Amino acid sequence: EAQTETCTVAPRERQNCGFPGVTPSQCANKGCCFDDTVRGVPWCFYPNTIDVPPEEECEF
Amino acid sequence: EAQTETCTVAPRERQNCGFPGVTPSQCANKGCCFDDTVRGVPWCFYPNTIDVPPEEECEF
């Protein structure tokens, strides 16, 4: 298996993982992927990214 | 300290790892790449080792 889905799941279908005000640090506290790019929906949710490569890259 | 195996290699230089008649499951069954897009050359071939030496950041 290679690169697959991601933590960017359907905002409406995103399985909440905490509170709406959750943050990158707050969420991680539980262990989920953050995404406050959409209001009304929870920022802390469960992701779905599958791959065999490393678990760290770069995005600057 | 961060190497990775790719498949985007040159056929003429690609390291055969399984005849073309091979299937995606067969080729991968050994742990090699499978590209049935290029004819004439070996469809199933070993991956490639590549690194990413820094110099100022990580977007290089």
> Domain with B50 in it: what CATH number?
4.10.110.10
Amino acid at A4: T
Q: Which residues of A35-47 are buried (b: 16+ CB within 10 A; e: fewer)?
A: beeeeebbbbbeb
Pull the structure tokens for residue B13. Answer: 């230089």
C-alpha distance from residue A32 to each of A11, A52, B3 (Å): 14, 19, 27
Least Cα distance to A57 among B60, B37, B49 occurs for B60
Q: Choosing among B7, B58, B60, which should be mutated to test the A contact, i.e. which has the most A CBs within 10 A?
A: B58
Q: Which residues of B touch A (CB under 8 A)?
A: 2, 4, 57-59
Q: Report d(CA A26, CA B48) in Å as an integer.
A: 39
Q: Report d(CA B53, CA B46) in Å as an integer.
A: 23
Rg from Cα positions in chain B: 14
What residues make up the domain containing B15?
A: 1-60
Q: How far is A2 from chain B (nearest CA, A)?
A: 10
Number of domains in chain B: 1
Q: Report d(CA A50, CA A14) in Å as an integer.
A: 17
- Of the candidates A53, A54, A60, the beta carbon closest to that of B57 is on A60
> Chain A residue with minimal CA distance to B58?
A58
Pull the structure tokens for residue A30. Answer: 């539980």
Whether the CB-CB separation of A20 and A43 falls below 8 Å is answered with yes
